[PDB]
Symmetry: D2
């Protein structure tokens, strides 16, 4: 069941209404790739939830108070300072997105090692619950074994892959939270701890990748026995003792439209922080009010009632769709991968099911989701933008997904009428087979 | 069936949780009276729909372009500018809210007649298909009393009549000679009408009344707080206009008054502001005098006590507030709540545009009007759910669920029906009160 | 010497240029009266300092955290919350602006005495070291007249006396028996005083008067629109307090009244809002009745017609408005304008906190009060410079340059002195008027 | 003379006041590199004017209307659409700063040529009024020959350097506006035209680099005979016919705190635009309200009265300082390079004059500017943040610069107490000699 929203709506952005008549000129002119579709034509946009969700009034006021100093920025203090209280790292380097924080730490952490341990470039390899090589447990992808912390570190797997390497050629460990395998599964503190030690020994750096830190917190609280009674920050603080440094995209749990963070725990890492400052000068990051905001989203992203709500309703949508037996090739907190061949068995791989599915939803409700499938299987993917849509929204979606599945029969398929050299799915244009 | 929100949500105000215990401490504290309950103790505050719901991005950006000149503010123009298009009136005085309009225009209109028609101070009576607290309080409190001329068919929770709050044209007709037209200083027309639980008025009905008014020639002040919900009802219900747009209907609608006085806190969806406007030169005279008064009361008529940004905003509210889809959603929802409530068997007045009314005593009947059956329901509701409702009373004193725009979802809706359920099945262990 | 602005500028409202020609069309149009000049025709609008100057980032962010509950809004608390700290009063009614406070509190205070002291309706008189338009208009317009008890030394543009707008303690003393203390319903204390051209009042002077008031025991309402500029003057001038902070002085200051009524449009630097407050339980009685009235006039005392965001903002205005540096700059500047004006030889009243006054007739003397020498200066100023000034008059009717906070720079300052120069040397080819 | 501001101030950010007492703990703890100084301690920050100036109320409202679509973003339309009306290019690709737009076009334009003309990588070279090689006229750096359009293209110089190369190894021409040599000098339309033709022939791409497009407009209007009577957009439109594509940092003339732009004129370049979309997917860019804003700053940046004002007062500051004979090693619209050895003759190169100068200003007024000098000469540099400070501000500065020049005698010098491996000036800490 869907929980009632633990807030009041104060500011809304209008969406017009669409006769299926109209919704077709549209998808036609889109040339059947909904990406290439005007929003403002999309009724319910499901294309992604990365900073496309709502904000709190404090977040808004925050944006009014930017001090746009280009140094010693009192705003920057605030941002880095809420980082110290929330995560207790003292080394905040605002980036402007997630992708930011990586483009900076990869090349440094590599070099730190290539030097004081003498790593070998062409035979180097990084590890991760989710080149990296992903060391996740066996339950991981077993939709239909209820394991509570599904994206944990395979401690042993990792152990092995380290010397299988061995220590001098692993620059770091990323520990994504929540883990990003299988539409987003939690990682336990006990596991987090565990894994961290497996690094202390071979002395490797541990980079906590936390776009969904708040959610992961909640799962630990909902589920790890011995925490059931810690608050979200309490959890989160403790959590962060098991990494040296954190790299996040604020556009998720932090609740802001723009923003990235790359930060460091203590001066045992000031050494590194020093070199990212050096690197960051040539590239990447942010408006002063941006910082004031993110400084707040950080605390706002963690309110319990909210996360409970947020996760509630992602859940609710999925329960909603199994109830009408729509196949999901995985379901979690990040996304929802409906399976399209199953929902649409009589349309081949080179006729494209996902696009086709995508367009129908579109015609029928005006939902915009996304062929993520091409070759393993053909998936069409859902995500939900925080504090943006309702249960009625969810209902409309679900229901729309019925009508699809009933006309599953005379819904057609697609064959290229233009396709660019790389990344076909972003601007290709299709027709049926 | 709840309609899905015709909009994405953009900015929310998060709200604290609660302990049943605490809540009790709270209501006990409130004078046993949810009304004086504090904002952060309530979880769904249905106290009133007046300036409490959401605004549009455009609305809010608008609030950053205030021109704050004390006199002849660009913003004042922008607002008059839109009053002309939306309603077609040419004389636009901004007041800070409806009470403003009203403390200004009654006494103005009361002197118009005391002279050119020699009206009798102590024998005077003003008419309306209803009057708000403010309207009659400010008319009782000025010397002149009102009498309502609603239809027989009015609050009858049995028959479902499409325009449930029209003017009784005849009961009005009568009332006019019955008091000597020299002495009706003005007729107020409320749209939608407040005390029907929010019931429509017909264009046709409007026409007809306007005729009687041009007849003894009496000012007609459209009271306009929910002008948009009214217009919608027409579009869905009055035969001729099924095909027009909302402004379109609005516009027609607004031919039948020499002036409008209005609270922008409801339909126009500003947190603050009201309008006092006149239609054409046949009234510039009045405008002139109103303008005079306004200084003294709200301040200079370039602001009538609005800041620049507020004018800017209302100037866009007035638009946004008419958007079709939106009111279809807004109304739907009030509606979906009422249906939700019939099915658990709670007798409530017809779906108006904005609130929902509840037969107090029936849901709990073994309570007599000595101990009050309206209030304890409030208290209870809150006690149990963290809902705040209140009882402004209307035969039978009863319970009102006014409903802030764009603020709560189907789910909040469902959570309220719910509490009425929990409440039903404890009517047995449930008491009465004297505050 | 202009002090440099103690702040970076963050958000500006760009302003249209002008053709001398057009400007003339414009003033001719205005009724020959700059006042009704339109906002975008003016280039430096000195019409009044009331809600027209700048706000702080904090102020403005604040406006995004409104809680908009009709009753018991978190924001209402935040605001009362800061009234307590800043002034130490415990009874905080928000009105939408000073007129509000005043339409509420006069009549309230007028019944206090009509009963417990049996005051005589028709024989009643209220006292003050001055009264604004609104204050006396709302007291003339309520039955009770005022008399001002300013000092001999008051408007004398010759002597420079540090606290130029004190109470004549004795001229007051006298006036009280002279009218029978049963009949003074209240004394209003203005700080700074408006009609001195903005002149300070002394803490000492305040004390002394408060004594006389506790004596015949009469309510003292501090009228508080420029309470901060007042406090500063003291800090720079009253001997004992040279060392304290502004709140510090404020606080002391505010012991000597049983209540304050206030317009936040000036010193507290909100675009909109006013306060009506009482100090301690010795008055909760009053508060109680004021609260009653407010409904009828501004609306429910959790907002007194303010939106949530406005409460939030003023709640931070009240602070920001006392910042030292700021008022040092604010005042400096008014000052630097006056000096600028003496040196081209224009006789103007002492530097008050906020405006600048001008001997009308002197700068142009071969104009007699038949043709008006105040107005044509206005017109001219504007005609020539795109300045708008106005003449609210004060012996001799004269010209006022009130000056919006944080809005115009030294340069704008210089550009105004300038026009007075251009204007001087054309007094020869310059005329008089009858509108 | 300083012109009065053609606006009203509405929103101010507070700055506290500082006893020189206090201003010293400060610069000390800064370790004598003012960069490392808390703003909020700086009275008048002169560190830079890149998006650290003010905005219009329309700019502010604009930021309230972001539609934060992750595609077909109605906001994006607005931004790209004001770009079409202002510059008439149809290919807007918002970046998130100036530096953005380059990191994208360099590598593409190189490749466009390396292929359809067959450029040679190690012997390739780009040209510019200001590797590139700068082809500016002889007057350029002659402080004290009043030439009105000082940063123009040396047509002949360029001519030569092209074949001296020849055409196949010049990927493009950048044409910075205003040109960035010698603290910012204009470029004439006639010159712009001229130069463009010198590319049409060898068919080279012309990339208009326009962080200060509005100012440059004004100079042309103030100065090119035959335009004296065109408006700023009129000028600007015409201007842009002489490039194929434009790369700007909105943080200057566009008047926003965040933002970049990379855009293209017509489909003769759609070809290229296509590949930058490809490249841009892996990296770089912006909040929806950001776009709404910049869409407005674009028009706002151009109001005449304003630019006149803005340039006025930059001028005024300089006239102000020659009047007290402070030596500027160059003066223009971008910055102001005071000469420090001249102002401070009795302090050597390895004792550092600029830092020393920087600190004194600081102690005396609380001005923060910047040693740009190390070896040619030792400069300390000023810039002014738009619509932020006043004339009184300027006066305070100027005057402060007197007191400096009178105690020119017992003002000391500096010698390293820590210096990092690269970019010493950003975090080094100094002491006197």
């Amino acid at each position: 069941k869907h929980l009632p929203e633990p807030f009041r709506i104060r500011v809304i952005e209008p969406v017009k209404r669409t006769t299926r008549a109209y919704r077709e000129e549209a998808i036609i002119k889109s040339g059947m790739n909904p990406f290439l579709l005007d929003s403002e034509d999309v009724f319910i946009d499901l294309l992604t939830d990365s900073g496309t969700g709502a904000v709190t009034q404090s977040m808004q006021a925050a944006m009014m108070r930017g001090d746009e100093a280009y140094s010693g920025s009192r705003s920057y203090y605030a941002l880095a300072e809420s980082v110290k209280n929330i995560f207790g790292y003292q080394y905040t380097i605002p980036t402007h997105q997630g992708r930011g924080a990586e483009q900076i730490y990869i090349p440094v952490l590599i070099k730190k090692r290539e030097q004081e341990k003498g790593l070998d470039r062409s035979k180097m390899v990084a590890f991760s619950n989710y080149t990296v090589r992903n060391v996740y447990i066996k339950e991981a992808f077993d939709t239909g074994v209820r394991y509570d912390f599904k994206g944990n570190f395979d401690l042993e797997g990792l152990e092995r892959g380290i010397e299988e390497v061995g220590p001098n050629n692993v620059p770091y460990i990323v520990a994504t939270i929540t883990s990003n395998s299988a539409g987003g599964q939690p990682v336990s503190l006990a596991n987090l701890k565990a894994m961290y030690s497996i690094a202390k020994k071979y002395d490797i750096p541990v980079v906590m990748d936390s776009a969904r830190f708040a959610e992961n917190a909640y799962f630990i609280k909902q589920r790890e026995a011995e925490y059931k009674d810690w608050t979200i920050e309490q959890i989160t603080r403790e959590t962060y003792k098991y990494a040296d440094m954190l790299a996040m995209s604020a556009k998720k749990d932090a609740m802001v439209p723009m923003g990235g963070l790359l930060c460091m725990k203590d001066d045992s890492f000031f050494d590194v922080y020093t070199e990212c400052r050096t690197l960051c000068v040539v590239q990447e990051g942010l408006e002063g009010g941006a910082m004031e905001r993110l400084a707040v989203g950080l605390y706002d992203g963690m309110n319990l009632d909210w996360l409970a709500y947020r996760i509630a309703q992602v859940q609710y949508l999925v329960d909603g769709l199994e109830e009408i037996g729509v196949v999901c090739q995985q379901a979690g907190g990040h996304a929802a991968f409906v399976d399209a061949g199953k929902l649409l068995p009589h349309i081949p791989a080179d006729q494209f099911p996902a696009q086709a599915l995508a367009c129908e939803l579109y015609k029928v409700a005006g939902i915009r989701a996304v062929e993520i499938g091409s070759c393993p299987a053909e998936l069409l993917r859902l995500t939900i933008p925080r504090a943006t849509y309702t249960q009625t929204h969810m209902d409309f979606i679900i229901e729309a997904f019925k009508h699809v599945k009933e006309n599953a029969a005379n819904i057609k398929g697609l064959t290229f009428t233009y396709e660019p050299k790389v990344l076909r799915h972003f601007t290709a244009k299709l027709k049926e087979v």
